[PDB]
């Protein structure tokens, strides 16, 4: 029975919202492919993943293939419905399908985000899912003397190790040099705020606006994004306390 592999490239640190994720389906065309009535490769992903249809590339033994199939594409997946007769030329060879999907801003940190690769023939159906993640961190803005006095209207931007600034575009995040494009994050009535949709890393907060009555911390505030720095099975990780001294 023809096999099925699904892989994701460089998934070790998770991914940013907006990042283009490289996926691959691999199978092997059976020697007796002419015996089959049906042969279809597909992916159907979570709605947190958007397919880039122009990315899709079918190769056999390294060579790009453009006929011998009908491609269907939708927002969160595709189907390649192959002509049996045409696959005879590729009997006994490896076929890969490379494609990309964008992680949307609806992707929650510390959740399994699945795709589902599938090979359907008339004899059998093979299914293999893969999973990706993004990360985040919670914070709470507090008085330096009293951790229970939580402070609204504190405004921060985020920086990476290079001193670049997190920008929100329509589709997700990008690090860039212009401070005026920096996405702003503000502590709420409970003093709380978070950063969601970053891959693993060491990043920093820079306070650009203090709560009324309080000083601006001139020191950048380091924080780590990694697996479970935001949540563990729905239960939220405890916020980093960000302290403010009063005038
Ligand atoms: Na087919
Ligand atoms: Na959290």
């Amino acid at each position: 029975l023809p096999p099925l592999e699904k892989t994701v490239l460089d998934k070790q640190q998770g991914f940013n919202q907006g990042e283009h994720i490289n996926y691959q389906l691999t199978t092997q065309i059976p020697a007796n492919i002419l015996g089959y009535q049906e042969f279809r490769l597909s992916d159907k992903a979570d709605t947190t993943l958007t397919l880039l249809p122009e990315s899709i590339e079918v190769k056999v033994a390294g060579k790009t293939v453009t006929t011998g199939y009908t491609l269907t594409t939708q927002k969160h997946g595709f189907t390649l419905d192959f002509s049996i007769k045409d696959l005879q030329n590729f009997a006994n060879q490896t076929m890969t399908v490379s494609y990309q999907m964008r992680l949307e801003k609806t992707a929650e940190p510390d959740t399994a985000i699945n795709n589902e690769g599938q090979l359907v023939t008339d004899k059998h159906t093979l299914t293999k899912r893969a999973a990706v993640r993004t990360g985040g961190k919670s914070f709470v803005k507090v008085d330096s003397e009293n951790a229970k006095i939580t402070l609204p209207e504190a405004v921060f931007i985020v920086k990476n190790q290079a001193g670049e600034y997190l920008n929100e575009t329509a589709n997700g995040y990008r690090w860039q040099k212009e401070k005026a494009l920096a996405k702003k994050i503000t502590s709420n009535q409970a003093g709380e705020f978070s950063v969601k949709g970053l891959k693993d890393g060491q990043y920093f907060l820079e306070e650009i606006s203090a709560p009324k009555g309080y000083l601006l911390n001139q020191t950048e505030i380091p924080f780590t994004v990694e697996k479970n720095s935001y949540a563990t099975n729905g239960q939220r990780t405890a916020p980093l306390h960000v302290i403010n001294k009063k005038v």
Side-chain angles (χ1 to χ4, degrees), residues 1-43 45-62 64-188 190-211 213-216 220-234 236-244:
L1 279 177
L4 181 71
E5 188 62 271
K6 181 186 210 255
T7 52
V8 188
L9 325 185
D10 303 297
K11 59 181 284 184
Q12 288 307 292
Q13 289 72 261
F15 297 92
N16 305 304
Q17 285 175 354
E19 193 158 23
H20 289 185
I21 297 165
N22 290 289
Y23 283 96
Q24 190 165 312
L25 300 173
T26 304
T27 191
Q28 247 275 346
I29 293 103
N32 62 328
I33 180 55
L34 278 187
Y36 288 74
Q37 308 242 64
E38 212 182 334
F39 196 96
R40 303 197 273 101
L41 282 178
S42 68
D43 200 355
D46 286 4
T47 64
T48 50
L49 280 167
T50 292
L51 173 70
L52 312 182
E54 306 299 12
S55 65
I56 299 167
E57 197 180 1
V58 181
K59 286 166 199 284
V60 181
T64 286
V65 168
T66 66
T67 69
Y69 58 84
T70 297
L71 173 61
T72 306
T73 59
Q74 304 177 288
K75 188 165 170 209
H76 311 296
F78 65 88
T79 302
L80 289 164
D81 187 12
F82 296 89
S83 167
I84 297 303
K85 213 215 180 190
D86 280 47
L87 279 175
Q88 183 65 348
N89 303 298
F90 300 119
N92 296 294
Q93 303 199 64
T94 305
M95 185 186 270
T96 59
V97 182
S98 312
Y99 56 100
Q100 290 174 326
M101 299 211 173
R102 186 180 59 238
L103 189 60
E104 291 300 0
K105 283 193 290 207
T106 54
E108 276 280 307
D110 295 311
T111 68
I113 288 150
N114 289 119
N115 49 319
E116 170 176 287
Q118 266 214 332
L119 167 64
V120 176
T121 82
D122 49 298
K123 313 205 167 192
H124 80 320
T125 285
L126 263 159
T127 295
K128 162 73 142 320
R129 299 196 205 67
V132 292
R133 67 183 182 79
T134 188
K137 182 75 193 160
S138 311
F139 313 83
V140 55
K141 189 57 174 98
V142 301
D143 182 278
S144 54
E145 306 306 301
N146 187 357
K148 294 296 175 143
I149 299 176
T150 64
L151 302 168
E153 308 300 359
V155 189
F156 297 88
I157 63 186
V158 187
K159 305 164 54 151
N160 63 10
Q161 315 236 66
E164 308 168 294
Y165 301 102
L166 196 64
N167 173 252
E168 181 175 350
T169 74
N171 290 303
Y173 286 146
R174 93 180 150 91
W175 296 99
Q176 50 72 61
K177 294 198 189 307
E178 182 48 74
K179 196 173 191 195
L181 287 173
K183 180 191 176 53
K184 291 165 280 290
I185 279 163
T186 308
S187 62
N188 69 12
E192 279 163 43
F193 62 98
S194 65
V195 176
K196 319 227 308 291
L198 294 176
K199 75 189 299 161
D200 297 354
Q202 167 71 271
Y203 310 103
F204 309 91
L205 299 181
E206 178 193 319
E207 192 184 5
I208 57 159
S209 184
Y214 285 87
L215 306 180
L216 195 76
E220 274 166 37
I221 296 140
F223 68 95
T224 293
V225 179
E226 58 180 5
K227 205 221 287 302
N228 300 118
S229 70
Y230 185 78
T232 314
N233 305 122
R236 287 272 302 257
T237 309
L240 185 66
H241 281 43
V242 174
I243 77 168
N244 275 264

